[PDB]
Design a protein around this ligand. Sequence first.
Ligand SMILES: [Mg+2]
Ligand SMILES: [Mg+2]
Ligand SMILES: [Mg+2]
Ligand SMILES: [Mg+2]
Ligand SMILES: [Mg+2]
Ligand SMILES: [Mg+2]
Ligand SMILES: [Mg+2]
Ligand SMILES: [Mg+2]
Ligand SMILES: [Mg+2]
Ligand SMILES: [Mg+2]
Ligand SMILES: [Mg+2]
Ligand SMILES: [Mg+2]
Ligand SMILES: [Mg+2]
Ligand SMILES: [Mg+2]
Ligand SMILES: [Mg+2]
Ligand SMILES: [Mg+2]
Ligand SMILES: [Mg+2]
Ligand SMILES: [Mg+2]
Ligand SMILES: [Mg+2]
Ligand SMILES: [Mg+2]
Ligand SMILES: [Mg+2]
Ligand SMILES: [Mg+2]
Ligand SMILES: [Mg+2]
Ligand SMILES: [Mg+2]
Ligand SMILES: [Mg+2]
Ligand SMILES: [Mg+2]
Ligand SMILES: [Mg+2]
Ligand SMILES: [Mg+2]
Ligand SMILES: [Mg+2]
Length: 62
Amino acid sequence: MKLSEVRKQLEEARKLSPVELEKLVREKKRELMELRFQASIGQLSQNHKIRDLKRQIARLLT
RNA sequence: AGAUGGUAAGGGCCCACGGUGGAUGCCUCGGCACCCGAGCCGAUGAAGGACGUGGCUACCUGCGAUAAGCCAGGGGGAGCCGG
Ligand SMILES: [Mg+2]
Ligand SMILES: [Mg+2]
Ligand SMILES: [Mg+2]
Ligand SMILES: [Mg+2]
Ligand SMILES: [Mg+2]
Ligand SMILES: [Mg+2]
Ligand SMILES: [Mg+2]
Ligand SMILES: [Mg+2]
Ligand SMILES: [Mg+2]
Ligand SMILES: [Mg+2]
Ligand SMILES: [Mg+2]
Ligand SMILES: [Mg+2]
Ligand SMILES: [Mg+2]
Ligand SMILES: [Mg+2]
Ligand SMILES: [Mg+2]
Ligand SMILES: [Mg+2]
Ligand SMILES: [Mg+2]
Ligand SMILES: [Mg+2]
Ligand SMILES: [Mg+2]
Ligand SMILES: [Mg+2]
Ligand SMILES: [Mg+2]
Ligand SMILES: [Mg+2]
Ligand SMILES: [Mg+2]
Ligand SMILES: [Mg+2]
Ligand SMILES: [Mg+2]
Ligand SMILES: [Mg+2]
Ligand SMILES: [Mg+2]
Ligand SMILES: [Mg+2]
Ligand SMILES: [Mg+2]
């Protein structure tokens, strides 16, 4: 159900959407990178956070 | 004095039980033939590929940096995150 929530917000992200959407994706990707480092160092993170983050970006990326 | 017997280092035939081997029977995701259907794809970049893609991933599979996936409509009604 995570989908409907964000995706609805995403056109809702039309205050300066395309621009705001880039800012957003950009932010997300940083989070993900921190996450890659998280999982990288080992003792840290628990999977899906990355899988869900990737998808969220793919949606965002529209 | 005269006259006559027994042993198996190993081998041979047979019997019993094995080892090796994968014939035979049964089985079948596959294959063959005919018939019916259907018949073009590409610069809006095809066919076919290379390298990448999973939290941990060797290969297969799917996918393409949005990477075993993104969105929307329809189906479907308890399971799901491929092998
Ligand atoms: Mg003998
Ligand atoms: Mg006997
Ligand atoms: Mg025998
Ligand atoms: Mg054998
Ligand atoms: Mg056998
Ligand atoms: Mg049988
Ligand atoms: Mg038979
Ligand atoms: Mg058959
Ligand atoms: Mg065939
Ligand atoms: Mg045949
Ligand atoms: Mg004919
Ligand atoms: Mg016809
Ligand atoms: Mg025809
Ligand atoms: Mg035609
Ligand atoms: Mg043409
Ligand atoms: Mg042509
Ligand atoms: Mg031309
Ligand atoms: Mg190809
Ligand atoms: Mg091929
Ligand atoms: Mg390919
Ligand atoms: Mg990998
Ligand atoms: Mg392949
Ligand atoms: Mg592959
Ligand atoms: Mg394929
Ligand atoms: Mg999308
Ligand atoms: Mg279950
Ligand atoms: Mg999966
Ligand atoms: Mg699993
Ligand atoms: Mg299977």
